[PDB]
Design a binder for this molecule. Structure first.
Ligand SMILES: *[C@@H]1O[C@H](CO)[C@@H](O[C@@H]2O[C@H](CO)[C@@H](O)[C@H](O)[C@H]2NC(C)=O)[C@H](O)[C@H]1NC(C)=O
Ligand SMILES: *[C@@H]1O[C@H](CO)[C@@H](O[C@@H]2O[C@H](CO)[C@@H](O)[C@H](O)[C@H]2NC(C)=O)[C@H](O)[C@H]1NC(C)=O
Ligand SMILES: *[C@@H]1O[C@H](CO)[C@@H](O[C@@H]2O[C@H](CO)[C@@H](O)[C@H](O)[C@H]2NC(C)=O)[C@H](O)[C@H]1NC(C)=O
Ligand SMILES: *[C@@H]1O[C@H](CO)[C@@H](O[C@@H]2O[C@H](CO)[C@@H](O)[C@H](O)[C@H]2NC(C)=O)[C@H](O)[C@H]1NC(C)=O
Ligand SMILES: *[C@@H]1O[C@H](CO)[C@@H](O[C@@H]2O[C@H](CO)[C@@H](O)[C@H](O)[C@H]2NC(C)=O)[C@H](O)[C@H]1NC(C)=O
Ligand SMILES: *[C@@H]1O[C@H](CO)[C@@H](O)[C@H](O)[C@H]1NC(C)=O
Lengths: 50, 106, 170
């Protein structure tokens, strides 16, 4: 299929109307970030020649 | 930068070769329509909100903080005066209460 | 197509697999970059049919209905001004979908300010939103309201100068 970007949401804009929140949600989200790699050392003489 | 929504705090957690941030954020919800105006015209003077916004539920005007609905009476303590009513486009007529008025009235 | 060359090439091992894997990683990385930059909203916002923004003109940045590509005049000018075993993979997001994402971002930031980026899109009049931005930089709301026509004229003039400068600089 041809992918859909998102659901259409026409915001009801007018020159004298505002939307004010009456409630709230405390949302906890995860962010995973790599920090380090495995420290690998290669003996060049031993690798090439044994 | 620190999660989706208005960032409140974050907690670090160790991970194998990595870090996991638990971002605690504030998300607005259950929004409601209100009729808004840039300024309030009273006694030939224009009143603007000091930190909030003027909202109307249909018949009465209040001032509330922008991120949460908490309607309060429009007074001189939460508004400031700058100029007359002839310049601001969309200014509406409403009374502005004075807290000092009952003190000398009594 | 030489069989003998491929037979001799097999003596060198998995070099070809390494090169193909690196190129595949680059190719998926480009799509990941495009997703990270442009696909930051999951709602496709649209502008109201009446363009009453308190004197502010956004015709040069909103999509043109007359154009089949549904691009803005600025975006159309930008697209006009940019000109043996090898294959070119097409990008996952086409130009019209990227333009649609930018249109959604423009509609969100015009009709809702910064509210759509932090949660549900909350409608606000554009002069009031501009006043909020003025308060963000430490200038009082009254200055914005009193000089609204001047600010709108300056903004329209600056947007036109941007289009002229892009059209006039190689
Ligand atoms: C604020 O008012 C607007 C306009 O009356 C509402 O927008 C309409 O909502 C209905 C209900 O789903 C939709 O069928 C219409 O298509 C909407 N109009 C537009 C132009 O989008 C809006 O829902 C109201 N907001 C709240 C929180 O009540
Ligand atoms: C704001 O939303 C919260 C949801 O987090 C509402 O809390 C719920 O209220 C109902 C009604 O009694 C309870 O049955 C739920 O158990 C409550 N949920 C939680 C997590 O406590 C809250 O009432 C809403 N407030 C307003 C004014 O709308
Ligand atoms: C807008 O809010 C005001 C403040 O609550 C409403 O005024 C109150 O209405 C109730 C119900 O009729 C009365 O019992 C109160 O005495 C009113 N308070 C004052 C100070 O007059 C007003 O009715 C609301 N308007 C709408 C359309 O909901
Ligand atoms: C808000 O109040 C002002 C001042 O009372 C109103 O302005 C008056 O409008 C009438 C009718 O056009 C004129 O005859 C007066 O000379 C005006 N007075 C001033 C001082 O300008 C204004 O019309 C009111 N607006 C609303 C919506 O009620
Ligand atoms: C917003 O700006 C656009 C472009 O600057 C205006 O469109 C121009 O309108 C005049 C008069 O109709 C034409 O002579 C120009 O050729 C138009 N320019 C283009 C690029 O088409 C538009 O009128 C302005 N105002 C509104 C309300 O959209
Ligand atoms: C909003 O637009 C209407 C016309 O559509 C106009 O009559 C009204 O005065 C405008 N209000 C503001 C605050 O700009």
């Amino acid at each position: 299929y041809t992918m859909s970007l998102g659901a259409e949401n026409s915001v009801a804009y007018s020159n004298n109307s505002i939307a004010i929140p009456t409630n709230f949600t405390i949302s906890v989200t995860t962010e995973i970030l790599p920090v380090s790699m495995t420290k690998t050392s290669v003996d060049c003489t031993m690798y090439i020649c044994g | 930068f620190c999660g989706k929504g208005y960032h409140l705090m974050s907690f670090p957690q160790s991970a194998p070769h990595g870090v996991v941030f638990l971002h605690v954020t504030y998300v607005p919800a259950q929004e409601k329509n209100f009729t808004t105006a840039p300024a309030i015209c009273h006694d030939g003077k224009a009143h603007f909100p000091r930190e909030g916004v003027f909202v109307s539920n249909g018949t009465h005007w209040f001032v509330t903080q922008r991120n949460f609905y908490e309607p309060q009476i429009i007074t001189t303590d939460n508004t400031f005066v700058s100029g007359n009513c002839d310049v601001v486009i969309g200014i509406v007529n409403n009374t502005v209460y004075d807290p000092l008025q009952p003190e000398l009235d009594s | 197509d030489s069989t003998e060359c491929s037979n001799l090439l097999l003596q060198y091992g998995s070099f070809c697999t390494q090169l193909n894997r690196a190129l595949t990683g680059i190719a998926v990385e480009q799509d990941k970059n495009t997703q990270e930059v442009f696909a930051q909203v999951k709602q496709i916002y649209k502008t109201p049919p009446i363009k009453d923004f308190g004197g502010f003109n956004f015709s040069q940045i909103l999509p043109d209905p007359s154009k089949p590509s549904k691009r803005s005049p600025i975006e159309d000018l930008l697209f006009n001004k940019v000109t043996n075993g090898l294959t070119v993979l097409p990008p996952l997001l086409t130009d019209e979908m990227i333009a649609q994402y930018t249109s959604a971002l423009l509609a969100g930031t015009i009709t809702s300010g910064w509210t759509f980026g932090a949660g549900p899109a909350l409608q606000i009049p554009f002069p009031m939103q501009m006043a909020y931005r003025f308060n963000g930089i430490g200038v009082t709301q009254n200055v914005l309201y009193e000089n609204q026509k001047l600010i709108a004229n300056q903004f329209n003039s600056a947007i036109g100068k941007i289009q002229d400068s892009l059209s006039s600089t190689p």
